[PDB]
A paper describes a structure:
Here, we used cryo-electron microscopy, AlphaFold2 modelling and structural proteomics to define the high-resolution structure of the RAD51B-RAD51C-RAD51D-XRCC2 (BCDX2) complex, revealing that RAD51C-RAD51D-XRCC2 mimic three RAD51 protomers aligned within a nucleoprotein filament, whereas RAD51B is highly dynamic. The proteins assemble into two distinct complexes, with RAD51C mutual to both: RAD51B-RAD51C-RAD51D-XRCC2 (BCDX2) and RAD51C-XRCC3 (CX3), but molecular analyses of their structure and function have been hindered by insolubility issues. Biochemical and single-molecule analyses showed that BCDX2 stimulates the nucleation and extension of RAD51 filaments, which are essential for recombinational DNA repair, in reactions dependent on the coupled ATPase activities of RAD51B and RAD51C. Our studies demonstrate that BCDX2 orchestrates RAD51 assembly on single-stranded DNA for replication fork protection and double strand break repair, in reactions that are critical for tumour avoidance.
BCDX2 was purified to homogeneity following expression in baculovirus-infected insect cells, and high-resolution structures were obtained in the presence of transition and ground state analogs of ATP, ADP.AlFx (2.2 Å) and ADP.BeFx (3.4 Å). In atomic models, the three NTDs of RAD51B, RAD51C and RAD51D, and three out of the four C-terminal RecA-like folds (RAD51C, RAD51D and XRCC2) were observed. The BCDX2 atomic model revealed striking similarities between the arrangement of the RecA-like domains in RAD51C-RAD51D-XRCC2 and three RAD51 protomers assembled in a nucleoprotein filament, by the stacking of the RecA-like folds and nucleotides bridging subunit interfaces. For the cryo-EM analyses, BCDX2 was vitrified in the presence of ADP.AlFx or ADP.BeFx. However, we did not observe density for AlFx or BeFx in either cryo-EM map, and instead observed that RAD51D and XRCC2 bound ATP whereas RAD51C bound ADP. The ATP remained bound to BCDX2 during protein purification. RAD51D’s key coordination points with ATP included hydrogen bonding of Walker A K113 with β- and γ-phosphates, and Walker A T114 and Walker B D206 residues (the latter via an ordered water molecule) interacting with a Mg2+ ion bridging the β- and γ-phosphates. XRCC2 binds ATP in a near-identical arrangement via Walker A K54/T55 and Walker B D149. In contrast, RAD51C bound ADP through Walker A K131, T132 and Walker B D242 residues. We therefore suggest that the Alphafold2 predicted structure corresponds to the active intermediate during the ATP hydrolytic cycle, whereas the cryo-EM structures represent the ground state of BCDX2.
Author numbering:
A (entry chain D): 20 to 200, 222 to 244, 251 to 280
B (entry chain C): 2 to 281, 287 to 314
C (entry chain A): 4 to 73
D (entry chain B): 11 to 66, 84 to 290, 301 to 349
Write the structure that this text describes.
């Protein structure tokens, strides 16, 4: 069975009690607004034991910014555990997987090769793609004036991501960067057509999050803080 | 990329020519193609195509690493490098971290070069580890380095030995910088087991000095070059596991009156750590964290250039 | 000063005029990357072209002895 | 692996190569220019240039020794030399800011005269390039300063009698001094950009030049309807170009700036390696070392005499 978005995070998905059968969500906003901290929060809620209030499901992290910090995640796990110890932290990290990608072509090849990974790990239900827009400018410049050439590899990546999400009832969280003057979309239409829930992050510590749900067009506002233990919703 | 003889075992000129005649030229086309349709054409064994796809995929594809293993390796391969300044070490929680990108931002004369030289001297003498200093604006001076060293020891021979552990490179444009960084990457690739030398800290003084003149007009070549430089720095930091310090300017917007880095929105995402230096005299600067993954931002304390 | 008189080829001059670049002042005020995009040449080629254009704009060297010598 | 975007290729050729599947330079190493010209739709010359482009230091102790043997340029002002660390250094950029009349041009002419002092007397024995943007350069004043310097060297030479000083003073002459100063007059921003572009070629055949002076970073008429030319110039036109010129040819670049007059762009403050502000206080001239990577900030006195720049 698969958990629901309400179970994963009951503060952002209070009205999403339906079990996930392939869901795609985007986190958008400027630098230092807590997108990666939110990813840590969800990762902790998934990989932590059921004894400590977690789901105990595996997570796959694809890092294209190279910004993943193992020490920060470890300290968050230590603070969220009632009885923190090295062995329990090691067990929690045993459900976490990390991949580094250096280019869009490299990312596409990795996505093609992850089919076996998903087949061999039935508990892997969360897929995080941090900065899907990491290679935007380089691909755009290498594509020339033809928009079809600029977006070719990202379009193929989007099709592969859709196939992966549908084939295995996964939840995909993709982080995008505010690189051009609220919300100015720039990624290929193949990616845009897939997004069901979008979230916008803002700074005031004090942080705010605006959730737009395209399934019903509902709009919501939330507030949270970040401390030594990670995210805590107000 | 392009299919070539010797790219992977099992590739022959005739097979490559048939595939190219059938509009299959790159590894991406091969892996993402319907191998049944290709196999029935060209008179090529389907199993041969399957093996070729598997080999190419296993060769050019990244693979996942379990979190526990990464924790184990980083527990021993990560180091904190004292900057030689007590207050700045207090701000940074014991100082620079290897494996990430640290940016120092400030105005003209704020103390960026002074901090870089203090760290270079402390690494060359206190740690006796090789440093690479990439000077793009003439900031580095050998007499200042020796002056900083003499405040640490009165042994002339030790001062000379420390001065021999610092490599200085001049790169006045983006292409020279990229060439120097790729040369360093290749050198580290050769000296896989090198320990006596094997520079461990890379200082890049005024990344802005080279990046800024690439931005202008409606062309996006400058953005791509800046992002390529960011990729080079990120691979030097994370892949090779060395500390990378980069100096960048500060700017203030006409409407957004706060202080911020100078290379635009895309660059703002690049550094893992950012230290802002401000002035209220010769010394008496204030330092605060403008960006971090391990601490709250906004805490400020004082540093004195004159003393250190 | 028009770019045809500097010594540039007719094809390149037309390719530049398609971007409203017609004089030495217009050419020089552009940066190397912009010129690379406009003309299709490489970096070293753009620098050779800049040197060619500036040889038609730069002043003449003099010596202080010659200045005193009237 | 080196991505093709990292090389100074032409954008069109790079796009053609990427469309043909080439991503890194290592894939273009073996292909022949003729084969490449047909694999992708480019001419033979472009293929040859592409292959050439694809195919194409000292520790701190060596630099310490180099800056020790290589001298400084004195200005005959003891306090200014002391705060500067010996004199105007080589392989660096020095900006002299201040309001008009402080004496920025007099120091430039004094350094032009002083870069020719023979090595046996502690000089560098070099020649000067003077790029004048304002037209303030005067030759008779240079004659006065050269005569004063020759008198000073003659006065010192008496102590050593017939040593190398005698032979050195023979070459050091007014006419030989004036024949080693190369003067350029840039009337506008276009000419300044052109001459800055052409300087390396001039220096490659004048290897005895050790000092380059740009008297005027922004033109004096101001009210710049040509603001675009100023923007393009100060954009790397005199930050990277002059630092590279100073380092490759081992000389000293001195820039004069009228805009900054008190203790021209937010990025232009980071350009010059050293910044000296000349300002009046109590109706007397003072020099402040506003920025420097090797000397702490300090203020000293100076004055101008018929013999040139001198202490108070
Ligand atoms: N231990 C801590 N205690 C309190 N606040 C913290 C702590 N660690 C981090 N923070 C705060 O949490 C913020 C996390 O934001 P973060 O940098 O992860 O955002 P982001 O959206 O992922 O950014 P980017 O796009 O630049 O990668 C940090 O900027 C800092 O403000
Ligand atoms: N030997 C010294 N002793 C004490 N203080 C010094 C010494 N040398 C320089 N300083 C101080 O350090 C300042 C120089 O700072 P620094 O070179 O780090 O500037 P910066 O912010 O990096 O500049 P830029 O961005 O233009 O390169 C000098 O103005 C002076 O205040
Ligand atoms: N023969 C001389 N004797 C003494 N002082 C002089 C002589 N000639 C010029 N001066 C002084 O030197 C100053 C030179 O200023 P100048 O070099 O033009 O400054 P800036 O370069 O900042 O405009 C003048 O203000 C003048 O008073
Ligand atoms: Mg983040
Ligand atoms: Mg500096
Ligand atoms: Mg003057």
């Amino acid at each position: 069975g698969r958990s629901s978005l309400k179970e994963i995070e009951p503060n952002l998905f209070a009205d999403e009690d339906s079990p996930v059968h392939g869901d795609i969500l985007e986190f958008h906003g400027p630098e230092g607004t807590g997108k990666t901290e939110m990813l840590y929060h969800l990762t902790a809620r998934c990989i932590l034991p059921k004894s400590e209030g977690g789901l105990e499901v595996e997570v796959l992290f694809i890092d294209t910014d190279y910004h993943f910090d193992m020490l920060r995640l470890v300290t968050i796990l230590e603070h969220r555990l009632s009885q923190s110890s090295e062995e329990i932290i090691k067990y929690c990290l045993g459900r976490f997987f990390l991949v580094y990608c250096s280019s869009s072509t490299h990312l596409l090849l990795t996505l093609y090769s992850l089919e076996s990974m998903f087949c061999s790990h039935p508990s892997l239900c969360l897929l995080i793609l941090d900065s899907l827009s990491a290679f935007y400018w380089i691909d755009r410049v290498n594509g020339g004036e033809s928009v079809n050439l600029q977006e070719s590899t990202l379009r193929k990546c989007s099709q592969c991501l859709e196939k992966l999400v549908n084939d295995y009832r996964l939840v995909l969280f993709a982080t995008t960067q505010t690189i051009m003057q609220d919300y100015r979309p720039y990624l290929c239409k193949a990616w845009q057509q897939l997004v069901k829930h979008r979230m916008f992050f803002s700074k005031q510590n004090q942080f705010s999050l605006v959730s737009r749900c395209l399934k019903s067009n509902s709009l919501k506002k939330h507030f949270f803080i970040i401390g030594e233990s990670g995210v805590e919703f107000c | 990329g392009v299919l070539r003889v010797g790219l992977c075992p099992g590739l022959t000129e005739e097979m490559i020519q048939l595939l190219r005649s059938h509009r299959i030229k790159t590894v991406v086309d091969l892996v993402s193609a319907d191998l049944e349709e290709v196999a029935q054409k060209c008179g090529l064994s389907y199993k041969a195509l399957v093996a070729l796809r598997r080999v190419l995929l296993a060769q050019f594809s990244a693979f996942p690493v379990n979190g526990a293993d990464l924790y184990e390796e980083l527990k021993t391969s990560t180091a904190i490098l004292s900057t030689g300044i007590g207050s700045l070490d207090k701000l940074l929680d014991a100082g620079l971290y290897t494996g990430e990108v640290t940016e120092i931002v400030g105005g003209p004369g704020s103390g960026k070069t002074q901090v870089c030289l203090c760290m270079a001297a402390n690494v060359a003498h206190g740690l006796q580890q090789n440093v690479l200093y990439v000077d793009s604006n003439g900031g580095l001076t050998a007499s200042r380095l020796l002056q900083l060293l003499q405040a640490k020891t009165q042994d002339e021979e030790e001062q000379a030995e420390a001065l021999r552990r610092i490599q200085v490179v001049h790169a006045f444009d983006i292409f020279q910088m990229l060439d120097v960084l790729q040369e360093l990457r290749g050198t580290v690739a050769q000296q896989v087991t090198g320990s006596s030398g094997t520079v461990k800290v890379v200082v890049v003084d005024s990344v802005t000095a080279v990046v800024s003149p690439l931005l202008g007009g409606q062309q996006r070549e400058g953005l791509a070059l800046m992002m390529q430089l960011a990729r080079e720095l990120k691979t030097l930091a994370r892949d090779l596991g060395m500390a990378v310090v980069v100096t960048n300017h500060i700017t203030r917007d006409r409407d957004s009156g706060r202080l911020k880095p100078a290379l635009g929105r895309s660059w703002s995402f690049v550094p893992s750590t950012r230290i802002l230096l401000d002035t209220i005299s010769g010394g008496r600067r204030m330092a605060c964290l403008a960006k971090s993954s391990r601490q709250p931002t906004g805490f400020q304390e004082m540093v004195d250039i004159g003393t250190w | 000063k028009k770019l045809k008189r500097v010594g540039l080829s007719q094809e390149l001059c037309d390719r530049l005029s398609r971007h409203q670049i017609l004089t030495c002042q217009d050419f020089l005020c552009l940066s190397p990357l912009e010129l690379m995009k406009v003309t299709g040449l490489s970096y070293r080629g753009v620098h050779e072209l800049l040197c060619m254009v500036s040889r038609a704009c730069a002043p003449k060297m003099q010596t202080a002895y010659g200045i005193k010598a009237q | 692996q080196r991505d093709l975007v990292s090389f100074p290729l032409s954008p069109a050729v790079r796009v053609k190569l990427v469309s043909a599947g080439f991503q890194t330079a290592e894939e273009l190493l073996e292909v022949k220019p003729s084969e490449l010209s047909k694999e992708v739709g480019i001419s033979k010359a472009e293929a040859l240039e592409t292959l050439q482009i694809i195919r194409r230091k000292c520790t701190a102790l060596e630099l310490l020794e180099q800056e020790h043997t290589q001298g400084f340029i004195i200005t005959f002002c003891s306090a200014l030399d002391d705060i500067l660390g010996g004199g105007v250094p080589l392989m660096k950029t020095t900006e002299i800011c201040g309001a008009p009349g402080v004496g920025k041009t007099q120091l430039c002419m004094q350094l032009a005269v002083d870069v020719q002092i023979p090595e046996c007397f502690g000089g560098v024995a070099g020649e000067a390039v003077f790029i004048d943007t304002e037209g303030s350069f005067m030759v008779d004043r240079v004659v006065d300063l050269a005569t004063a310097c020759i008198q000073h060297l003659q006065l010192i030479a008496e102590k050593h009698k017939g040593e190398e000083h005698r032979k050195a003073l023979e070459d050091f002459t007014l006419d030989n001094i004036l024949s080693h100063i190369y003067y350029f007059r840039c009337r506008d921003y276009t000419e300044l950009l052109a001459q800055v572009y052409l300087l390396p070629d001039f220096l490659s055949e004048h290897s005895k030049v050790r000092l380059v002076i740009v008297d005027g970073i922004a033109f004096p008429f101001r009210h710049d309807l040509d603001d675009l030319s100023l923007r393009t110039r100060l954009l790397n036109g005199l930050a990277q170009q002059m630092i590279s010129l100073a380092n490759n040819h081992r000389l000293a670049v001195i820039l004069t700036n009228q805009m900054t007059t008190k203790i021209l762009g937010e990025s232009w403050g980071h350009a010059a390696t050293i910044r000296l502000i000349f300002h009046w206080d109590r109706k007397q001239r003072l020099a402040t070392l506003y920025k420097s990577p090797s000397q702490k900030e300090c203020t000293v006195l100076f004055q101008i005499k018929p013999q040139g720049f001198r202490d108070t």
